[PDB]
Write a protein that binds this ligand. Structure first.
Ligand SMILES: CC(=O)N[C@H]1[C@H]([C@H](O)[C@H](O)CO)O[C@@](O[C@H]2[C@@H](O)[C@@H](CO)O[C@@H](O[C@H]3[C@H](O)[C@@H](O)[C@@H](O)O[C@@H]3CO)[C@@H]2O)(C(=O)O)C[C@@H]1O
Ligand SMILES: CC(=O)N[C@H]1[C@H]([C@H](O)[C@H](O)CO)O[C@@](O[C@H]2[C@@H](O)[C@@H](CO)O[C@@H](O[C@H]3[C@H](O)[C@@H](O)[C@@H](O)O[C@@H]3CO)[C@@H]2O)(C(=O)O)C[C@@H]1O
Ligand SMILES: CC(=O)N[C@H]1[C@H]([C@H](O)[C@H](O)CO)O[C@@](O[C@H]2[C@@H](O)[C@@H](CO)O[C@@H](O[C@H]3[C@H](O)[C@@H](O)[C@@H](O)O[C@@H]3CO)[C@@H]2O)(C(=O)O)C[C@@H]1O
Ligand SMILES: CC(=O)N[C@H]1[C@H]([C@H](O)[C@H](O)CO)O[C@@](O[C@H]2[C@@H](O)[C@@H](CO)O[C@@H](O[C@H]3[C@H](O)[C@@H](O)[C@@H](O)O[C@@H]3CO)[C@@H]2O)(C(=O)O)C[C@@H]1O
Ligand SMILES: *[C@H]1O[C@H](CO)[C@@H](O)[C@H](O)[C@H]1NC(C)=O
Ligand SMILES: *[C@H]1O[C@H](CO)[C@@H](O)[C@H](O)[C@H]1NC(C)=O
Ligand SMILES: *[C@H]1O[C@H](CO)[C@@H](O)[C@H](O)[C@H]1NC(C)=O
Ligand SMILES: *[C@H]1O[C@H](CO)[C@@H](O)[C@H](O)[C@H]1NC(C)=O
Ligand SMILES: [Ca+2]
Ligand SMILES: [Ca+2]
Ligand SMILES: [Ca+2]
Ligand SMILES: [Ca+2]
Lengths: 448, 448, 448, 448
């Protein structure tokens, strides 16, 4: 279990609104990396997922032997452990168990979550290029693997209701899932088939971030028209790209008990990868900006239970215009107008302040993470701290031109020294070993 | 415990003399690295030690937060696990436990060894520059830490007899130790004080490798004179630089039961770092070439027991003129004449063939490892396979100029597929994260 | 069920057009044969049928106690199991159930197919020499046996419509059938009676392979005339030798629900033995060359359903001039001109590349299998890989003169190691035990 | 379970003394072989073990990929099933489960035995040439694997008392073991160390078959002297070559509960491979003639229990001078005089008549099996029926010169047709597939 210094400083809003204004990033600290490196120049390690809870943490990433493209073979590395203080005062992520799922099943886009006594991981089995998944009416095989600290492993092929003949494809968001009221929730996304109930119930719905008006040159009527069209992709089999949550009861004999809960397209942007968080008793969702709006998307999620089962989810966006992501064409970091984009990168963010602490939800919110500081290239990885409109602290890593990709950020507090540490898991392009080197950067978020 | 595919292919001579002539190195294979990376540009990870036995493996290395120099603080990372096959057929070193000794004790030059149920590590506590250790008549504190797989940890300060007032300094060789007949043996080296019994019993002794004559331009009398002087260092407090073995009985209450067994200087070169191996029931020793002879030094060690206690060791050298190491001045890779050098690098080698299988010990021996292919710079890391006089297979890693340091090589056979794999743990200079990135390269040694 | 290493590498085109050009056959690998041997010098085991699907495989062959000729007694051996990896990396066909249909019913020319939970086998009951079957206006009794993995066995005598008074004889093609959209499809062939609707609707129809013109010395008008006559056999009761497909709904009370679907003689050659395959969602058919064209015949089959029932089939030939088969007289492997032949051997082929991946269907197709390399004798069994015009890789088995007969080839990929294996089931003439020894040769199809 | 036609005709003496005089071998019958064949010319399948009991049968053999020599890798094929009648009246060994132990553990000289609900197999792990096993004072690892029909598999490393420091080596006899009064008994053999209690208690003991006197030209005193020396092998590490029985209680957590019971050297010849049988409630033992006496050795074994545990075994030889085996030098099939031989072949025999039915034990005994009819070569496999002094029925298989090796014979009666069938499992040298083809020949033993 995690050291006494951290058990009470996990999954919480660490600073008050007033303190958020005076936060800065401290130097990067050196700790032994718990994320394994490739041992060949061409080896590819990508798509990390990290879950940290009161008792322990779970980590995983995909491994492809040659290059970063394969719709046939790949392995998935899983790791779990605890956090303990070093003589210098900062954290050391102590790995207590390692697993390497290597058996011919092409498990991809995996999301992992901490569960009592272990980790629960959700993946889909890839057997063809992603685009092909959207055209085929049949969805890929879905799997949830439970790995207990006592080395017992139980993998199940799941068939949640409302998936077959509704979703042409379904993928975990790769971002961490969360254990909530006895259920494990994972972010999901995919393409819905035209004519289905879901498609019809979503017809004419759209979402436009609160701060777009002041930045978009198009009029309200034009924005609305373009936003509605941003949820449909002709390139991806003419499917409605949908975001949602997969709720699975913690059982070892899962079959069709997991529930697919899609977000209303009136509250969320075009479906994309994502991540779920827990701040106190509140669930939050991060949605990758793979559509027209290039800014960080965070939402407070309200989950409704009907007869002990999740029945519906509602999302309230934290309005911001900060931390853009690189995109292609008319969907770069400089875009502000609705339309149809299918480009971007995964770059989640951690809320250091409570959005509900202000009279108007999210009026003054502070968050931290990493982002690729450029308009269209996946370059210049930069760790930051920002509020709704400005970056109040940042530090680029490496020299300009340094390639990078996804960035998963997680923060926790040392209740002993009373300092907050954040880990920024970034996929860095390396010139020595492997295509990428996933690095768990760690530093303090200083108040002052 | 290790998979059934490896339990019977560990610590053995894998090939016959005839087969050794047709061995070649296969491509590097990609597996998840079990050696942790630094998370800052200046973080320093160095001095690895690796022990692999029938049941499991032990790994460790030193971590310094800023740069690679400190005689005050540093931490020591320890790891242990097993080997299991991947769907591609090659090994995956599965970490089952991690430890980070971080408490203010500056444990350095640590050597680790597998023991039933865990790992035994031997370190010395550094409190001043190395050179200062040789001048002070008092030796550094010595410690042996036993770490059981059941998480029990027992550290002891040891005071073996014949150390105080004999050795001005004493260090573990950093190379792996071995569990032999109930005792854990570790390679050691240091400086002996003038006038001591050890010094006197070693007076006028010297060792000259069998293949030096044909390569040295000096006459026999001159070589003998210079060789005798190569065991004394005026730069290192005028001490006799000695190599040896530390034998510790496997106990949890060690105090003065470990025994310091020095090698006769008539059979070994000037003391240096080293490593111990087990090939069947035979113990072997690798001695870093930190003196005048720049070639790989391997010896078969014969241990004598008197009343259940190791009482003396004898070493028989495997005569070679292959695989040189970079050195400074008149002690570079091109040197062949006796004299006093105090320069070189650690680069052990694994014997793929049995030296005793030939009528004349070591007449035709084959070994593998890595070496820095250059005369004086620690550059061009190159993995190879060689016999007594030639390199019969090699492959440089990275582009010329690539900096590197130590190299620990270990081989084992998959008794299922019947192929031999070797792991080459090399300290590589990295430009992205940390001063060095210790990489566990792995590839096959192909027969044909 | 099959190991995770194979469940996703079955019934697919494994290579791209570009990769097909660089394919070669690896050494034969040794695995325990799952095909039973005879225990007497005269015992005869022949006519194998093999079906491999995602979950498991089904195998069967005919057993005659004395010699290879009997129109009265014979037994049929059935076997089923899964595929799992060996420590050497290659497959082991693990038999999980064996059955020996020995009860006096002379079941012949059986074709077998995998079905959910078991195997479905289709045979006809022989009671007289084959030639006699064509002269008698009454067709032989037809039977389909379902054998579930739970040991339940259900055999039914079927009477599909349009058989009585239309087909003088009807036989399964012996090649595997396939489970498609809830129906089990089997290849069939036989002789149709003059004056029947089928006969009339087939009148004046003929098929000439695309690559015959350039190789045949006869003019177009003469070729057309001879091709039309190749579908009628005076030796076989003056019947129209027809090829087709038998579609049976997966039920345990089959009576007259199976449907006989003949191929149009404008798209297929004279009826003969055959086999059905599944490549993704596409059905393919292999037609033994028992007529004038001695080259491998493969067709993509398009099945039309009318009210949930197969109503018609269409075949598109993959144009080739490669891999001939031994024949008698003016119908040997060297023949190229239309006429009436009734000679040849069964030698199916597996498509390693997708014929539809080229702008012009089958313009560049690659396939593998075995063939008897000789003009008129059933001799020199040779495994190969070939494209439309040339054999790009081959290896004869045994010494010249080695007798053999049928060859059933099936390939699948290990999604773990990412290699393709093909099994070549060949009837080999043996000098020790039995007339023939049906051997499941297995080797890899290497890319490079 | 076995068909009703065989459940009551297993493990019994089938004929009376009077009927034994009129027994003859019927033609070989053709049934589908349940023993798997190799699929490469060099593949090697050898060392079969077969156990047949009231409910079912167990079968196993060793598989080496290249040639028949390896002290590192090999796999072990296991099979189990039942017996059922065919329409022709004779047996069909129906395989209901197959297993292929392929994981890097070099399991050799395995003996298998039927147990309620499955099979228990006993093997030793080879890691060096056989001769080396006798010189090393440490015995090879011993393992017993239980394989239940419900697919549960439990393998255990056993350490029976009195093995370490007593037996330099220990091997299962490869012949079948038997389930007796809740214990599984396996034949064993190996080399005992000089000076051990076993060695001392065996000192000066020897056994000379009752019918040697009349055939040996040496006098009684000389025979006795030479016989005593035949139990010690200087070629095999100067060990006393011992035969015995390993008794294991049927448990799934075996550790040190199995008991090593050596035969008194006053009742048995030099240790060798062997087999255990059950005839009614009596245990019998077959001992390979690897010493000076080249004739078939069968003994009735009396087992003594002390506190529910086997405590001692006694053997009574069935005196014969029939069915010799090929041997080397002065130990060929023509030898009759005591001395030290270490040559021969495994060729067990089944007793068709009860040796205890005669006033003088074994005065008139009849048995059947196969033997290599030649003086020194492993050639001319011949199935027979013989009494103490003559072969009363025989039939060679193949043409003279045909190579073969071991032969395991098992007989049982069809209580329906009232006929006895015997299966002769013979390792035949094949020219087509594999080094050997282990064939389960089957025929009737006719009374008349
Ligand atoms: C299931 C899957 O493939 N997931 C990948 C995701 C998804 O593509 C994303 O969530 C949208 O569905 O994203 C990642 O893959 C992208 C990456 O390989 C980049 C590299 O340039 O290319 C993207 O594809 C572009 C393509 O390059 C364009 O030419 C055009 O075809 O549009 C596509 C849009 O997808 C990949 O999607 C990612 O790195 O962000 C990784 C996940 O494996
Ligand atoms: C206890 C200890 O310091 N161990 C280090 C060893 C020992 O120095 C070696 O076994 C000989 O006693 O070696 C390592 O350290 C050397 C490394 O830092 C190099 C880098 O250039 O410098 C060596 O020192 C040189 C120095 O650079 C010269 O100017 C001159 O003073 O000679 C000294 C000789 O020691 C370090 O010894 C090593 O990397 O090989 C690392 C161990 O920590
Ligand atoms: C139902 C049946 O008999 N099937 C057999 C098939 C069919 O004959 C084939 O699909 C054409 O209808 O083919 C196999 O049998 C042939 C084989 O026994 C060879 C051996 O030489 O002889 C063929 O018959 C020849 C005969 O030898 C000629 O003299 C002349 O009469 O023509 C006939 C043509 O049939 C057998 O057909 C086969 O091995 O290919 C086996 C099937 O059992
Ligand atoms: C554990 C083991 O090796 N078992 C093998 C047994 C034993 O050798 C036998 O029980 C005596 O200990 O026997 C088998 O192996 C023999 C076979 O390979 C023959 C082939 O010629 O050679 C025998 O070795 C001879 C050798 O050829 C001679 O030159 C001289 O060295 O004597 C040895 C005597 O052992 C093998 O033992 C067998 O086939 O009978 C097979 C078992 O694997
Ligand atoms: C943060 O710093 C500002 C600037 O000096 C100070 O005025 C403010 O009180 C601090 N914020 C709080 C309340 O911690
Ligand atoms: C290795 O290769 C050589 C060169 O062809 C060959 O002659 C030799 O027999 C091989 N070595 C052995 C004995 O494995
Ligand atoms: C196959 O080999 C050829 C010959 O070197 C090479 O040029 C080609 O690129 C390879 N085919 C592919 C694309 O895999
Ligand atoms: C066996 O055959 C002999 C020879 O005819 C006959 O005399 C004898 O009675 C038979 N044996 C018995 C008793 O079955
Ligand atoms: Ca789909
Ligand atoms: Ca000192
Ligand atoms: Ca008919
Ligand atoms: Ca031994």
């Amino acid at each position: 279990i995690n050291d006494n210094r951290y058990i009470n400083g996990i999954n919480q809003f660490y600073f008050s609104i007033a303190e958020g204004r005076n936060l800065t990033l401290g130097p990067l600290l050196n700790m032994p990396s718990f994320i394994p490196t490739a041992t060949t120049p061409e080896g590819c390690t990508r798509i990390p997922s990290f879950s940290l809870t009161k008792t322990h943490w779970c980590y995983t990433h995909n491994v492809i032997l040659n290059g970063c493209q394969d719709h046939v073979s790949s392995n998935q590395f899983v790791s779990m452990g605890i956090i303990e203080p070093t003589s210098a005062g900062f954290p050391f992520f102590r790995t207590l168990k390692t697993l390497y799922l290597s058996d011919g099943v092409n498990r991809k886009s995996c999301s992992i979550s901490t569960v009592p006594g272990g980790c629960m991981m959700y993946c889909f089995v890839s057997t063809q290029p992603e685009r092909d998944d959207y055209f085929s009416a049949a969805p890929p095989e879905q799997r949830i693997i439970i790995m207990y600290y006592n080395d017992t492993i139980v993998e199940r092929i799941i068939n949640p209701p409302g998936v077959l003949d509704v979703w042409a494809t379904l993928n975990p968001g790769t971002g961490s899932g969360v254990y909530y009221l006895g259920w494990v929730l994972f972010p999901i996304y995919g393409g819905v088939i035209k004519g289905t109930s879901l498609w019809n119930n979503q017809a004419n719905k759209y979402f436009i971030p609160q701060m777009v008006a002041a930045l978009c040159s198009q009029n309200q009527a034009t924005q609305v028209q373009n936003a509605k069209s941003s949820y449909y992709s002709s390139w991806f089999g003419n499917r409605m790209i949908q975001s949602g949550i997969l709720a699975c009861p913690l059982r070892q004999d899962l079959t069709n008990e997991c529930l697919v809960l899609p977000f209303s397209n009136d509250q969320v942007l075009m479906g994309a990868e994502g991540r779920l968080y827990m701040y106190g008793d509140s669930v939050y969702y991060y949605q990758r900006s793979n559509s027209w709006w290039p800014m960080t998307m965070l939402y407070k999620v309200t989950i409704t239970f009907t007869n002990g089962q999740p029945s519906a989810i509602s999302a309230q966006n934290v309005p911001t215009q900060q931390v853009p992501r690189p995109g292609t064409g008319d969907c770069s970091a400089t875009n502000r107008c609705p339309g149809f984009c299918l480009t971007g990168v995964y770059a989640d963010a951690w809320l250091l302040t409570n959005p509900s602490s202000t009279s108007t939800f999210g009026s003054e919110a502070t968050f931290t993470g990493s982002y690729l500081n450029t308009a269209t290239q996946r370059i210049n990885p930069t760790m930051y701290i920002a509020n709704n409109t400005q970056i109040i602290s940042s530090q680029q890593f490496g020299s300009s031109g340094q390639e990078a990709a996804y960035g998963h950020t997680t923060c926790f507090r040392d209740t002993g020294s009373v300092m907050v540490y954040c880990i920024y898991i970034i996929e860095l392009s390396s010139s020595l070993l492997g295509q990428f080197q996933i690095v768990p950067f760690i530093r303090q978020v200083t108040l002052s």
